[PDB]
Design a protein around this ligand. Structure first.
Ligand SMILES: COc1cc(O)cc(CCc2ccccc2O)c1
Ligand SMILES: [Yb+3]
Length: 606
């Protein structure tokens, strides 16, 4: 049973399709419209069902052309309020009805950010966007808000005519509003059954330019040139992901580069991946995020996790594919380098939570836990680590990729659990059941802390990062003169970032070493968001006052949670800046993405 959802479970009824016809109102910061759900019954004699809702105003519910009775339950925190609909005629098993619910969103909807014009690049027009992973789709519309249910949908969206609307679906045409000539209706069809966390909307002044045979890049006009350059290897990545995954079943693959308040690096919305504009490093150095979003097209969007207790199935197989893409493009030694960094970030998450803390288990139990609160790098890296370990044990990359394609093939258009994964892994590796029983499964799946085994890693590109970091850390004042900008000359931006990751793991350092590091490396000049973030974290943790305004400036001007939350956290901890960090949050709380705003307020103990 899906514990994070209050709707009737899939064992009762199943949404097959959603028709949504809505209207984006920027004066009220609301979406208003109707959600017509086509619901099949799974039982005999079905007379009622519950849907998920959150801060939605419900005007009425119409089945068979007539208003039916319904009741809203009391709010249950982050879960929202259940919405029971009294059905007018009892359904037999497999009977299908259409429920059309007239609704309105609240401006406080946790799934949406309402951007004023000054918060955009252009400064003339407003912007709005959505993030429904994990359980915020109920903040947009009543639904069975669980990934245990997949549905197709269609939409018609009325927006200011000067604006443009996109969704996670095939764009199905645009027309002016028959009822209101100042507006446009844009239409969307999604023919592939999807879980509702992938429903996506963005409304703004968008421009497009084509970067491949199935890719257009979407953003504000100021951002299109840079976006088209930065993501020009997407077709190449797709061809690899198809060769490893099997056919791409979604048709198009467009990329939308969002404003900086977007809280994730990416979101794998079918046909329209959302990406952070912090990926625009000028050099395609952060292209692995695109490889993560492309990979989700199979592992995530096709093979879906039945519940959020099994999210690792989403992220771990995806991180496994993403590094496989990156491995093709740039070499097997590069895959291992990324893999090893991954274990590095897993070390930090376990250090941060504590090695016995429940969110460090691969499979979590999310009863009474906001998924926004549990979100970490753990499910990505522990999932990846498990799959890497399994690769090595079971005969290396070629064989484990055979398992991975069969896995997509085997579970496409379904929502699975960990036993469904492990059972199939066992059916596939019939001849290696002895190898598999050797694996310690309770530990990998259900024990907290680090995995019980570490897989073998090639060290070739990593050894240079570890060397320079150790040189800095074992340096005493009288060695600091020997550091020089030629220390970095054979370092890729990636090894550089790994050098800072290595160093940050041992923070703090003497103020003097940091001062010197700036002096000869000019890290401050670097605009790569990964490098800068770690360099800034290193400076604040090492107590450098000069870095307060920079780290502050990064924490607010962008809003990617991977960077924003540790920056406010480090700053809260540093005595000299603690009070500016709290006051800066409170100055910008209103203007922040609601989930980011929530997590930073808790992080800051406001
Ligand atoms: C951005 O997508 C998510 C949003 C959330 O609020 C929560 C999640 C996943 C929650 C989760 C699942 C499994 C293991 C750890 C974990 O944090 C994902
Ligand atoms: Yb010395």
């Amino acid at each position: 049973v899906d514990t994070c959802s209050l709707a009737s479970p899939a064992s009762v009824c199943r949404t097959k399709h959603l028709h949504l016809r809505c209207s984006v109102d920027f004066t009220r910061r609301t979406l208003t419209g109707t959600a017509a759900l086509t619901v099949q019954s799974q039982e005999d004699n079905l007379r009622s069902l519950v849907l998920d809702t959150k801060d939605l105003t419900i005007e009425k519910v119409v089945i068979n052309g007539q208003e039916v009775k319904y009741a809203l339950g009391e709010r249950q925190s982050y879960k929202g309020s259940p919405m029971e609909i009294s059905l007018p005629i009892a359904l037999s098993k497999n009977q299908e009805i259409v429920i059309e619910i007239s609704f309105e969103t609240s401006p406080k909807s946790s799934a949406l950010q309402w951007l004023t014009p000054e918060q955009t690049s252009g400064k003339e027009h407003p912007y709005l966007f959505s993030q429904c992973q994990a359980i915020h789709c109920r903040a947009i519309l009543p639904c069975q808000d669980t990934p245990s249910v997949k549905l197709t949908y269609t939409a018609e969206v009325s927006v200011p005519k000067e604006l443009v609307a996109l969704m996670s679906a095939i764009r199905d045409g645009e027309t002016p509003d028959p009822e209101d000539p100042s507006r446009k209706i844009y239409k969307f069809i999604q023919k592939v059954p999807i879980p509702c966390y992938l429903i996506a909307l963005v409304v703004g002044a968008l421009e497009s330019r084509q970067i491949g045979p199935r890719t257009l890049v979407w953003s504000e006009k100021e951002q299109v040139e840079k976006s088209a350059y930065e993501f020009s290897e997407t077709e190449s990545m797709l061809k690899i992901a198809e060769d490893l995954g099997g056919p791409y079943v979604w048709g198009q693959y467009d990329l939308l580069v969002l404003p900086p308040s977007f809280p994730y690096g990416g979101m794998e919305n079918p046909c329209l991946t959302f990406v952070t504009p912090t990926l625009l490093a000028g050099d395609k150095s952060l292209s692995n995020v695109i490889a993560h979003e492309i990979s989700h097209s199979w592992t995530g969007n096709l093979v879906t996790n039945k519940t959020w207790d099994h999210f690792w199935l989403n992220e771990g197989h995806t991180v496994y594919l993403e590094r496989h893409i990156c491995g093709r493009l740039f070499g097997e030694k590069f895959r291992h380098f990324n893999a090893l960094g991954g274990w590095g970030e897993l070390q930090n998450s376990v250090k941060t939570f504590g090695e016995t803390h429940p969110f460090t288990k691969l499979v979590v139990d999310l009863t009474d836990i906001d998924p926004d609160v549990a979100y970490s790098s753990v499910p990505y890296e522990k999932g990846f680590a498990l799959l890497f370990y399994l690769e090595q044990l079971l005969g290396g990359p070629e064989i484990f990729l055979g398992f991975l394609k069969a896995y997509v093939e085997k579970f496409s258009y379904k929502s699975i659990t960990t036993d469904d994964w492990k059972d199939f892994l066992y059916s596939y590796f019939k001849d290696k059941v002895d190898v598999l029983n050797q694996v310690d499964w309770n530990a990998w799946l259900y024990s907290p802390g680090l995995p019980p085994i570490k897989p073998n890693y090639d060290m070739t590109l990593t050894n240079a990062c570890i060397a320079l970091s150790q040189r800095w850390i074992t340096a005493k004042e009288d060695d600091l003169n020997s550091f020089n900008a030629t220390d970095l000359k054979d370092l890729s931006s990636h090894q550089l970032n790994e050098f800072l990751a290595q160093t940050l793991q041992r923070a703090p350092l003497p103020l003097g070493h940091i001062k010197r590091m700036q002096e000869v490396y000019n890290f401050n000049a670097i605009n790569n968001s990964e490098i800068r973030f770690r360099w800034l974290r290193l400076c604040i943790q090492s107590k450098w006052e000069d870095a307060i305004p920079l780290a502050l400036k990064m924490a607010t001007e962008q809003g990617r949670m991977k960077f924003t939350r540790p920056l406010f956290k480090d700053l809260a901890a540093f005595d000299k800046s603690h009070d500016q960090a709290v006051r800066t949050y409170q100055e910008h709380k209103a203007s922040m993405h609601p989930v980011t705003a929530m997590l930073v307020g808790k992080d800051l103990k406001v």
